Amino acid sequence: PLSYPFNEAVALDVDPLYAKLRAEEPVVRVSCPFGEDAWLVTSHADMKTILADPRFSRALAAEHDESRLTPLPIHTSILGMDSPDHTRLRRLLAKVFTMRRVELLRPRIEQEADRLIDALIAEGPPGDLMEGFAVPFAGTVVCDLLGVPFEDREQFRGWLDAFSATTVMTEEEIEADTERLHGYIAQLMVRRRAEPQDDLISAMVKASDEEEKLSEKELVELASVLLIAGHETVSSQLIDSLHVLFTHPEQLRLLKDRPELMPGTVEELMRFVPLISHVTFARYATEDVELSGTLVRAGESVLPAIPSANRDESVFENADRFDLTREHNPHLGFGYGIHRCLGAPLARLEMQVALDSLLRRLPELRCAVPAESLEWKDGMQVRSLLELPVLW
Ligand code: HEM
Ligand SMILES: CC(C)[C@H](O)C(=O)N[C@H](CO)Cc1c[nH]c2ccccc12
């Protein structure tokens, strides 16, 4: 079977093999960097099936040497569970991670974007939209929400890569950093149990201790993935989105003159940005399933190449084109079905506030270097810039 990934992900370029696979062989057998061989799934319709059809399981992966790009299986907490365990954690989170809580964060989120832009301006151009905006914006928001002290970022931020690194960390470094993060969250939970604050960890501990009993370890592992999602996924998506906007200056001009397009713009960025470097987490078939002419037998794994589903020309017209006016946008950038992104309302809020504020306050914002000089973060499960120098 083809060794997969076929090629290292470069900048935001999509490997042209996905288009060929989608056209000529949408499901193909591959060998993975780690774990068992798998079926690479490339089309939008098959993506929905393996993500939402109950014939495909995440919890089954623990009964295998899970097909994966990471040296060790990731502690994916809720995202590694099936019903009923999944239902138990999803209910817990939905009860404390309410829409009211999110919209109550809006003024704090807006204020953080304005404060970050005040700093960029006071420091003068060129500024770095990654370490000077996307990272601390995403970080302060998730830290505010979760109850992780943003002041501890110096400690915990260097452990987060352990949850995402493919080629650039050893088993031993991943295991050590995973233990460091879990143990840091566990100490936080002791404080938050005794001294609850208005944050998710306190609410989760209270709800778990009182009704929806979770083990300490389950609580730790769930708070940990919430930290990763808010800190890393959000800042990665945001900085990649700014890159897309800078490299499509015509759409950036359109957005600035019709701000009511921002909701559809965020959705189009979710679709178009190939944020996931290759695939999200493998599922395993519990029964035989045919996908685009390929029989996937029970016990075999499928790799969901979500970014390729989001370039499916049979679902999105001119799927290879970034078009922030796109109206039909059933993208899978926030997943689909049972494991669809619980944080999507918040991520959409953050995206909209960040882009609106930047475009509002920095009218002539533009990249300070040619796209060729940019340094990307390689060897992770998502794509991101290390620096995005800008003028204004
Ligand atoms: C732009 C930012 C984000 C993107 C692109 C994103 C994307 C995704 C995707 C694609 C999935 C499904 C993965 C799969 O099926 O293998 C997912 C699941 C999930 N995401 Fe998000 N996410 C983002 C931000 C967030 C935030 C801010 C949170 C929480 C504060 C969050 C929490 C979760 C959780 C808990 C799950 C698993 C839910 C379950 O298994 O039931 N994400 N996310
Ligand atoms: C979830 C997809 C966008 C993709 O698999 C990804 O970024 N995984 C990272 C790195 O392994 C881990 C992660 C990010 N949010 C999560 C939410 C729940 C569990 C794990 C994660």
Describe this entry's structure for a reader.
It contains 13 helices and 11 strands. With 392 residues, the protein is an alpha+beta fold. It has one domain. A hairpin with a 6-residue loop joins strand 2 and strand 3. Helix 4 runs parallel beside helix 13, helix 7 packs across helix 9 and helix 9 packs parallel to helix 13. The longest helix has 32 residues. It is globular and about 60 Å long. It starts with a strand and ends with a strand. Protoporphyrin IX containing FE binds next to helix 9 and helix 13.
Helicity level, as a percent range?
40-55%
Bound molecules: protoporphyrin IX containing FE, the ligand CC(C)[C@H](O)C(=O)N[C@H](CO)Cc1c[nH]c2ccccc12
**Computed Rg:** 21 Å
Q: Quick one: biggest sheet?
A: 6 strands, mixed
The total tally of domains equals: 1
Read across the widest sheet, the strand sequence of neighbours is 1-2-3-9-6-4
Could you tell me the strand content as a percent range?
5-15%
Apparent shape = globular
The strand count comes to 11
Estimated structural class: alpha+beta
Succession of helices and strands? EHEEHEHHEHHHHHHHEEEEHHEE
Cα separation of the termini: 50 Å
Specify the number of helices: 13
InterPro entries: Cyt_P450, Cyt_P450_B, Cyt_P450_CS, Cyt_P450_sf
Binding site for heme b: 86, 90, 280, 283, 339, 341
GO molecular function, one term: iron ion binding
Protein name: Cytochrome P-450
Layout of helices and strands:
Layout: E1 2-3, H1 17-24, E2 27-31, E3 38-41, H2 44-52, E4 56-57, H3 85-96, H4 99-123, E5 127-128, H5 130-146, H6 153-156, H7 171-194, H8 200-210, H9 216-247, H10 249-257, H11 262-272, E6 283-285, E7 289-291, E8 294-296, E9 301-304, H12 306-309, H13 344-361, E10 366-367, E11 389-391
Parallel strand pairs: 1-2, 3-9
Antiparallel strand pairs: 2-3, 4-6, 5-11, 6-9, 7-8, 10-11
Helix pairs in contact: 4-5, 4-13, 5-9, 7-9, 9-13, 11-13
The structure holds protoporphyrin IX containing FE and the ligand CC(C)[C@H](O)C(=O)N[C@H](CO)Cc1c[nH]c2ccccc12.
The site of protoporphyrin IX containing FE has 24 residues, from helix 9 and helix 13.
